[PDB]
Structure formats: C-alpha cells, structure tokens
Amino acid sequence: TKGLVLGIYSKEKEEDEPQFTSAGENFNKLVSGKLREILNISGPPLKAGKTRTFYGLHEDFPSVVVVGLGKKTAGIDEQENWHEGKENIRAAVAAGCRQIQDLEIPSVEVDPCGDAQAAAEGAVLGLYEYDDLKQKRKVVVSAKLHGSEDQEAWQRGVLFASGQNLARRLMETPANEMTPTKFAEIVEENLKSASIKTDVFIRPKSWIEEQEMGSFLSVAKGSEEPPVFLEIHYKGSPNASEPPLVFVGKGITFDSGGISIKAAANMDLMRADMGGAATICSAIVSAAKLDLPINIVGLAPLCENMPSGKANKPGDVVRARNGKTIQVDNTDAEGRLILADALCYAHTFNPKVIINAATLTGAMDIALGSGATGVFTNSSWLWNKLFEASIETGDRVWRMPLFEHYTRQVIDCQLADVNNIGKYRSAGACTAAAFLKEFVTHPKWAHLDIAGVMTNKDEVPYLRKGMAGRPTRTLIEFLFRFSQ
Template sequence: MNFELKTLSLSAAARHKCDLLAVLVPEKFEERDGAIGALAVRARSAGDLEDKPGKCLQAYAPEGVAARQVVLASCGDGSPQAVRKAVLGLAQALKAPAVRRAALVFAAAPQKGAVDAALRAAADAAYVYRATRSKPEGRDLQMLTMAVPTAGAVQAEFSRAQAVAAGVEFAREWANRPANHATPTLLGEAAKSLAKLQGIRCTVRGPQDVAKLGMGAFMAVAQGSAEPLRFIELRYDGGAKGDAPLVLVGKGITFDTGGISLKPAPEMDEMKFDMGGAASVLGVFRALADLRPAVNVVGLIPACENMPDGRALKPGDVVTSMSGQTIEVLNTDAEGRLVLCDALTYAGRFKPAAIVDMATLTGACVIALGGLRSGLFSTDDALAAELQGAGEVALDPCWRMPLDEEYGEGLKSNFADVANVGGRPAGAVTAAKFLQRFVGDTPWAHLDIAGTAWKGGQAKGATGRPVALLLRWLSDRAAASASADAAPKQRKRSPKG
C-alpha cells in the first residue's frame, strides 16, 4: 500500500474522489465545515456517533460528498493512543474488496504523534498475508491519503511513520511464513536482500563458520534438524566511524517442536512464530535504510530449527558455550536461551554501547503480562528507562521485570556451570538470569516478546512487535548523541596576571 500526505479542509475532503473517506472526529467537535462537518456534528448531537475511540458511523454516498462511502470514526481526546484505536476500528472497511483508494481525514489539527499513530494503525489494519496463497483473495488497498489541515507541519512525522510501517510489515511478513517457507537458509536470503538497500551490510555464516567460532550451545540446538543453521550479521553504519554500536540480537528458531522435550500437539503450528525476535531485527534494518539515524547498529540472528531426531540434544546433555561456560540441558524446549547465549557472547566483540536482545522466550511472561506489554529485563537502569519510554511513545509498550541475584539460584547444576532452566516459579526471570551470565559488564536489556510477537485464535498472525519500540529507541539515541555533540564546550579561562 502507498501513502500520500495532503492538506485538506473538511470542505476540500468532501470533494476528494476515493472509494472510502474515513473522518477522525474528536470529542466535542462542533465545526460545521461543509457537508462532512455538518454530518459529524448532527451525528454527535443525535447520539449516533459516540465519543469513545473506535466507535464508527457509516454512510453511503451522502449528498455533497464525492466519496462512495463515508465513515465517521470517533477518536476521543485525539491522543495518539485514541487515534490508533479509532483507525484499527476501521479495519473491516479498509479491507473491503471494493476499496482501492481511501482517505483518512483529521477533522481537527492532529496532536503530536497522532499522524504517526494513524498511519501505522492503518498499515496494520490493511495488512493481508498472501505469500503462500495460490490465489489472492480480494483486492488490496492501493493508496491511502492522509489528510490534515496543514500538511507541512507533520511532514517529518509522516515520513518517519512510513519507514516504521515498512519495517513492521517486513517483520510480520517473515514471521507469518510457514516454517518450510522461512527456513534458516531463507531467513539468511531475506537478510541479504536488505543489503541491497542504502547503508546496510550483511554476512551470513553456515555450520562450519559457527563451529570455528566455538558456538557449542547454538550448534547443539541445531544438530537435530536436517535444515542447516545460519548465523546472520547485519550492519548499519550511520554514526561516526569508531562510535560504539548498539547491538540487537534476535532469537531465530524458525520452528520449535521442543526437541526431545516435545511440545503438546495443539497449537504447535504457532511455533513458526518462534523466530519473532529474528523477524524484528530484519524489520528494524529494513526501516533503518529509510530513517538513516546517526547511530551505528549491529543485528545478530542465530537461526535454526529445534527438532527431535536421533541426533537431537537430549535432556541431561552438557554443552559448552562460546563463552566457555558449560550448560546442563535439563529441558530441550528451553532452546532459545541456548542459541542466544552464544550470540550475546559474540556481540561482545563489537565493544557495544549497549546490547538488546528480543525473543519469544517464555510462556511464563505471557502469564505475567499477557499480550499487551513485552517483558523488559535489564542490568542498566538508564537503558531500561530509555526502552520503556520509547515503548510508550511508539505505542509498543513494555514493562520492567526484576533481576534479583536470588532468582539465579534455581539455575545451579551438579554437572555443569549452569542449568538451562530453573523451576516453574518466575520462569521468565530465571530465563533472563541465564542470559545475563553471557553479557559481562555491557549495558544489556532483554525483551521477552512471547506474548506480544503474535496473536492466536481468529486473529492468528504476527504483530511485528517490538520493531516500533526499537526504532524509537535508536532514533532517541541518535538524537541524544547529536545534542551532546552540539552542546557548546566551555572554554578554559586563563588566570588574570
């Protein structure tokens, strides 16, 4: 879908030719500007259009309006959160087969962040997965016009939102693909395709390269699969040469059976989403090519399948990680932390300013936070605050969880340096404590996205989270660095003689 930004008053919007004209109406709206303004005021006065965000009122070919269909959508107080709810409420209308060109009109001047929220929500609402369908169903929305009273005031926000939406869609597309259409090899090819974009470099390593690096934990997970592993490294050099990079690490288990500790059959198909962290890294780099922030970024993806054949890792096996630490594998279904620990050790080679990993790691995090917020664990208070703040602004929220030393007691082993699981209590925390052992003193954060990377049931599909959160954090880091560089340096005064 393509987007365009236009300056349109409500009177001008009434003359705009399109299949669907969706108007975002804030609470207490009283401006009778042309046919649309009058219609909105009458609908609110009659109580047919409630002020609650997401409430809609449809009209077909109303008099004085060029569009075939008009939908009035309440956006409450006009905040980005309310606007997002309003636009998501338009999903069915945006996906209608007859709608090829649509316009999304702000009845009043948008608040800061509202255009960003509206565009990304529209992209989410209109997204349709088609990669493995034999025949496309219906017709895609081809053009969405964003109409505001003054386009120049929100042009930068609009352009940024386009880039973020493209990154989120790239992540969703790869996470949604069935495991036989998103093998580690194909994930590597997807990463290589990003290297065709401006400023992106890519290196993909195979089993022999990984063996030379000594990634024994990663290799152990992959050994039960016929699909060869891939270790993907992406680079974006937007900052000054020599500036310490920010490293993103994404869990890339392209299908997780649980291995010998086999998962139950119901809903096992959803384990194709176990590479949601990897998909997020790909999505971030897709957007970085357009956003071009002044920051250096490294993306690392350890990609493999977790399968239960005769060569597979067994409960009780002890493996040696790249760090040299030995790990007793008590549960082969706790494989994500095994591939991540070697990638985190490798990340240290870049002497990074910070490391952030994201992984569909634990069911325990789903129980704790549900599907609203990702779990955030960090060894650094400032980094945690940055990520949590970025998530709030990006409408991709997370919540900080504890990392008390006592939680690590359950990972003790009689036969290795550490076990890969503790008991059932605080499972998301003990998983994070395991990962913490492999990051040293580098500021580090772990995002457990098991509850947020995809949805099940009728709405089954990837969400593309936490791409928006990560891009906001990277942009904030770039802005903070630019501000620090621009700050005037105090000159030393010579003592008076």
C-alpha cells in the same frame, strides 16, 4: 473509486455538539453541511473506536466513514504508561480503513486527526494481512494522507508501521518457507534496499564451528535444515570507529521442542519462535531507512529445533564459545542455548549497549500476557530509555527482576557450570534471564522476553488476528531518540 476516513471527537461538557477535526469540518463545509446533518439523523454520537458510513455525500467520495476519536485533549495516561490520544487515533483509523476495505474500495484518503504519524500507523498496521498463500483475498487498499500539510509526520508513521509489518510477515510465514536461509535472504534484501551503508554476512555452519559456538550447534543438529548465523552492519555514524549499539535475536524458525517434545495443541504457532530475530532485524531496517547517524550491529543465530537420531539428548553437556559448560536438561529450553553463543560474540564488537529479544518462555506469557514486553536489565538508564520510548509508541514494556536469587537456581548444576532449566518451576522467565546473564559482562545489557506479545487476537485494536510483530516500533523509537 476513492474512500474517505474522517475523525470526530467526543463532546466536551460546555460544547453544543461533538467537534470534527479540521479536515472533518472542512469536508462538511464542502458539502454544505450535509455531513453534520446526516450524522445527526443517524442517531447516537460516535465513541472512541466506533465508526459509521455515509453514502453519496460527494461525487469524489461515494463512501465516507466517520470515526470516533475519544477526548481531544487525551495526553499521557499515568495509569496506562502511554499516550492515550495516539492510541485512540491508531485504533479509530484502523477501524475506518477496514470498513473501506470491506466495501471493496481500492483507495482511501485519511484524516491526519491532529497527529498524522499515529493516523498513518493505524491505517498501515490496520490494513495489513498475510495472504500470499491464499486464492481468496481481500482488496488491496492504498491509503494516503488527506491534504498536503504535515506530510513528514504521515510518512514517519508509514515507516514505523511498515517496520512492524515486516516483522509480522516474517513471523506469520510458515516454517517450511521461512527457513533460516530464507529469513536471512529476506532481511538482507530489505536492509540493502533501505541503505547502501550496510554489510550483511549470512555465516554458514563451518563459520559457526570456527567460532566455537557449540551451544548453538547442539540445537541445530537435530534438524536437516542448515543453520546460519545472520550478522548485519548499519554504518550510519559519521565516525566509522564509533562503537556500535548491538542487537541480538533468537531465530528458531520452528520449535518442536526436540526430544523434550511439545504437545500437539497449537504447536503451529511455534513457526514464530524467530520473533526475536524478526523484531530486532526489522528495527535495524527501519533505522537504516531513517538514516539514523549511529552505527548498529544485528546478530541472529537461526535454526530449527527438531527430534531425530542426532538431536540434543536430555542431560548432554555442551560448551559455549566462552568455555562455560551447560547441562541440557530440557531440549525445549533451546533459546537460551543459542543466545549464549550470540551474546558472547556480541562482546567482540565492543558495543555501547547490548539488547537481545526472544520469544523465550511460556512463563512470560503467564506473567504479563500481551499487555507488555518483559524487560530484564542491569542498567536503570537503559530501562528508562526503553520505557520512555514505549510511552510514545504505545507498544509497552514492563521491567522484570535480574536478582542473584534466580542465578542461584541455574548455577546449582549436577554436571556442568550452568543448567539450562532451573531447579524449580517457579519464575521461569526470571531464571531464563539469569541464565543469559552468565554470558554477559557488559554494563548496559537488556533482555526482552516477547513470548507474551507474539500474537494478537483482539487486544490491540489496530492489529488483525495473527502474529503481532511487537515491539518493533518501541525499538525504532529507542534508536531514534538515542541518535539525538
């Protein structure tokens, strides 16, 4: 019928037994001490992230899963740059919820564990799974807050997690289904359901050609799938003339590499080469659901990178919207090409800040893996705001260098103004970022390379195996704090 997830902390030295949360101690009382008695009989105490299931304790809750929360007073961890307490909660709740799902129970009530937003994030992120195309599926579990106190915190958590889950769905979906047009239509419907203060323009190829986006066009032409330039507006500020914050996302729905073709091994993961677009767009949908009082513009060039009789050829020279020429030495370095045009266009909105996200380089994954998103920025103020936000969400960011040293390696070019791959193979993520800087004149610009946090195997406990949707929540948190 209905399941229940309860938390218990690790025992502190001067305590006689590990302490339950408020909901845990109360439940124990409701069942006349039966919960504590059975936990004692079952064996060793529960450590952070571990779970244990007890049956028949109450007629309304035939299955009760107790989860280990770790140390009660865990706050900000200086070594890890995150709030440890929140991370323990998200992981423990996800584990509890999955045990309830394995038991095939359709609904679960969750202990707020001293921080309802984090508990909600663990349940919602933890239970997610993309199974639309399978006949064999797990039971759909409805998770709700146990109790009626602090409902707003719980709901804030569901909102944040739902935002990241949308990014995951968009990324996980096979490319033949998640085409440039389909992605745009899904985002449009999600933003419009979130708020009536929105405008969406799924700009077609003719518009792209009118905007002189020759760099973006050179990439798209190799494929038979039509390209689109997604532009979204969220008018949340009281003053309509208030300059917007602009977000830009790389939307390659599928990257085969083009003529500079990729190796077969694990190339299926390239259906998520639109993760940049998925994360910034989901962040705008959430900000819109939250009705944040700020104006926001989202831009996402979308297309496929395929080999054919009309594809980009190594050595070809293309002209960006701003007139700069680019020598396309490697057709698989296509993200920086489409972003050159999107970033130029971003300046037309005379924005307050410009933030782009992209699953850009294999070098970023080699650099930091899934530990943190790499952030390249010309503004320490901006770096600090993103960093602070990440400490709260736990979806970490780490700063990478924007030095002229790297710019030199991309402007040293045989045929044009700038080369799309550096002279050397060293510092791939840094030279890619340097390339993007040639298309930015704004004082507050940040580039997020999310190639390393594209997927999850088991690094983040509360995310099942698959596309991660990172760092959506950090983006939402940043916008939230910015609006205040």
